[PDB]
């Protein structure tokens, strides 16, 4: 890490509003699609 970096690392959290329900819904949809195939 030789060389002064231009920015300090910060968490990539930008999609602040991420309900657990939506994430599990998307996982279910992907799971269903793969199972069907």
């Amino acid at each position: 890490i030789s060389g002064v970096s231009p920015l300090l690392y910060f968490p990539p959290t930008t999609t602040s509003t991420t309900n657990r329900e939506d994430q599990i819904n998307k996982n279910t949809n992907i799971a269903i699609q793969m199972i069907k195939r």
């Binding site: 998307k26 996982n27 992907i30 799971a31 793969m34 199972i35």
Partner: protein, 57 residues
């Protein structure tokens, strides 16, 4: 009244024995052709991997 009856009576044991053997053979076939079928289902690890890829990670 006499002859055919006597020969039928003589036949009875062998026929009974053969039919018993035939029934045993058929039940033996019933059990022989039974097998336990183990099904294979898509591993969920691939599902998790695809989920990760969809996230653009």
């Amino acid at each position: 009244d006499i002859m055919v009856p006597s020969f039928v009576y003589n036949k009875l044991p062998v026929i009974h024995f053969l039919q018993e053997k035939r029934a045993e053979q058929k039940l033996r076939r019933v059990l022989d052709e039974t097998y336990t079928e183990w099904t294979e289902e898509l591993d969920q690890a691939h599902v998790t991997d695809a989920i990760t890829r969809s996230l653009n990670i």
